[model samples]
Target chain A: AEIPKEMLRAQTNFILLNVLKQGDNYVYGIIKQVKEASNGEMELNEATLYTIFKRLEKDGIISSYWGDESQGGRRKYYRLTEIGHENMRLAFESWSRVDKIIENLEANKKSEAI
Target chain B: MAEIPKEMLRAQTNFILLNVLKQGDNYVYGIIKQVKEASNGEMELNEATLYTIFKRLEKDGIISSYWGDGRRKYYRLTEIGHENMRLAFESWSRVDKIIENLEANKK
Candidate 1:
């Protein structure tokens, strides 16, 4: 959808957490999955994903390791740490709160004849 | 929605601008009041932020501004601004879809 850079950046934690929560995955797979998941609405390039992945790892929110070479050429796989799970839950809750606020605003507008 | 962050604010500035224009020709304070009231006070934009966005939109040709009675400034959407509104909703729909998935995964 060509969202602003910062907006996309803000979503990095949420996206990676959820994707990794499903299972450990490599960068290419995660990128492909996010694109498919968003129906191509979100296209995170390799560089952006790598940058966020590194940040997430450095923050102790996620962990990564080299996968077995026999499996598929030694890709680096990522998985959510316990903190990542908790963070993801909190992010989801915060998002829902925002959603509810917007919903209420819409309802308020409708009822008020604006 | 809930104390919108700077990044989200950047993305939604256009949405809010077009929304106020949709309401009718509006001045800055009027726009702020409408947004604050709509959100039930969850969103209270400061004057500096509002004016900065207004100036940018005006410069981008999305809106036109003029002085009204009492020398108060007013703004209205240009044709491109209306088109931008449609695009803004599209961007929001993308977010809505992601939210829907995130919520669904919760269950």
Candidate 2:
């Protein structure tokens, strides 16, 4: 319930990458899916999502395009770029390595266990 | 390799704070030194970050502080603080397990 913002930021990347894995998705849909994935325990506001989207897009990890507004307001869809896939790989690897370090330290009951 | 993510650093900070109190009461400088050594000089926390977290924990009653030897302040964990530390470990373990499962399913 009190998940830190930093943790949420990491999950922000993971959720975006994972959702885009299946296919391109609109912003609201991704938000909905992420909430479902977290069982309603986590959420990112529209503003936060847009901020992250802008950064990822600016960094070339993700690309966005405007979809038709025939139904209502225009929707923006996002998908992972080639570089984005590579970023996911690196992020996952990085997460795993950190997990391993903590696991080992905890398993050994080291004083530095964190 | 990239010096860990911010989330990782936050988790590490939890361990550092709790571990310091687990040993005995200490002040901010001591906690910073202990953390630096614990991480093998890998972390050097800024004073503001340390103080802000300290203030938060104090407000949450997870830790209590008292002045000692003039301007120096010392901190010790409350009963709830110890419980919170255990909870933090459990929380992190759950997160790790979820991540492991995700990685396993990644294709």
Candidate 3:
């Protein structure tokens, strides 16, 4: 493909949103889960990742709660919000459109190159 | 293993930094090139994405400039920035240690 052509910020947001959709709620466990599931290619950093979470939370896209810390430092668990769900729906649409555009552009390029 | 529990901020920073290293220069073009080479995935937005590039530059790393074109900004190519990219290399070290510890715990 000719690259997704979706803006980088938008794509990054979708990546995280798609991640949350697969699981219900998570602390670091979910992060670990998603990264592992992707076979370790997802490269989300703590700062960018959590800050995104914070941003999502602020936007009502997700919500968080501190889990019990009897085991040690409590982890904050994140859950997708109703708004987040709506965002995910919109995100899906955005992804599809970009993917389609890239596919078409690649076809055109191949035609021209040949 | 164990999610490689490095901090989120740290990981994301490395992602962008490693990105800069692979292809020398970028504005949106370099970004587009990396994402394409990665096989059509790797999201960056004009907003958060540009912000990170700005931050990296602010740290005395990854220089960029507007490329010429009236009203159309052009981007300058960036140099190796080994010292800065070193943070991610250290990240690899950190990842190894964490993976080793996790494995040992499993054993």
Candidate 4:
């Protein structure tokens, strides 16, 4: 029993920003790091990854540069814009609240076994 | 000082809305206010889009809608929706755990 795949999409922006903060990374690199960081706990498709980066780029949180080649695909790398680095603290704070609300609701559900 | 994006905030609407209903039935304005207050004004969902999610969740049977005495409509997670709610929470915690791992790994 499973649900729509889109639920996984919600957190990518937060995850990607953190990954890029570590260093400039390409799509595959981003995907790999996310998987490794999660201990192979989660995954994503190229389509979803590409779309989020485009938004991140348009938002000016990250800027892209073409790297010569990687896996022979001429992969482009993404690095944090000034805004990207600046936003991390607030993002974490916001997400902490987001996570806590979910945690709280989850506990609320458990109280009555809903 | 960085890392928050309004996009992810909006993206979380469906899960949060449905989960909030699990606590108890609530109307649209009430839901967004709670989300805004919970995030300390960092997140907002447009009224236009909130209705869209309401319709979609209702159509899919994860939630149901009705009008209360005050003319404001309310939504609640359905009995079957509780199963979906449980499933969604499992999915959310998976990502939450992964994000924590990503945040911790510096190399």
Please tell me which predicted candidate would have the highest DockQ against the true structure.
Answer: 4
Per-residue lDDT for A10 in model 1?
65
**Which lDDT tens digits does candidate 1 get at residues A1-114?**
234445457666457666787778888887777777687878778898888887778767788888888767777888888877776666666656555555555666678786
True contacts kept of 3: 0.00
Q: How many backbone clashes does candidate 2 have?
A: 0
The candidate 3 chain B region of ten consecutive residues with least summed lDDT is B1-10
Q: After superposition, how far is residue A72 of candidate 1 from its true place, in Å?
A: 9.8
Tens-digit lDDT string for candidate 4 (B1-87): 234555655655666777688878988888777767655576666789888878877878878888998498888889878987677
- lDDT winner among the candidates? 4
Candidates arranged by TM-score, highest first: 4, 1, 2, 3
Q: How accurate is candidate 2 locally (lDDT)?
A: 0.67
Candidate 3 stretches greater than 4 Å from native: A1-11, A69-73, A95-114, B1-107
lDDT (10s digit) by residue, model 3, range B1-107: 11212233344444454444343444555555544443345444454666665665535544556665435444443553444445545544544444444344335
lDDT of 1 by residue, B14-80 (tens): 4555666765788888777777876678787888988787787788787898889768788998888
* DockQ of each candidate, alpha-carbon based: 0.21, 0.15, 0.05, 0.37
Off by over 4 Å in 4: A1-5, A68-75, A95-114, B1-9, B12-16, B26-50, B66-74, B103-107
| Alpha-carbon interface RMSD for all candidates, in angstroms | 6.2, 5.8, 12.9, 5.3
Q: What is the per-residue lDDT of model 3 for residues A15-89, given as tens digits with 9 covering 90 to 100?
A: 566556654556456557546644576455666677677767777877888776877867777777777777656
- Screening candidate 2 with a backbone cut-off below 3 angstroms (N, C-alpha, C), the clashing residue pairs are none
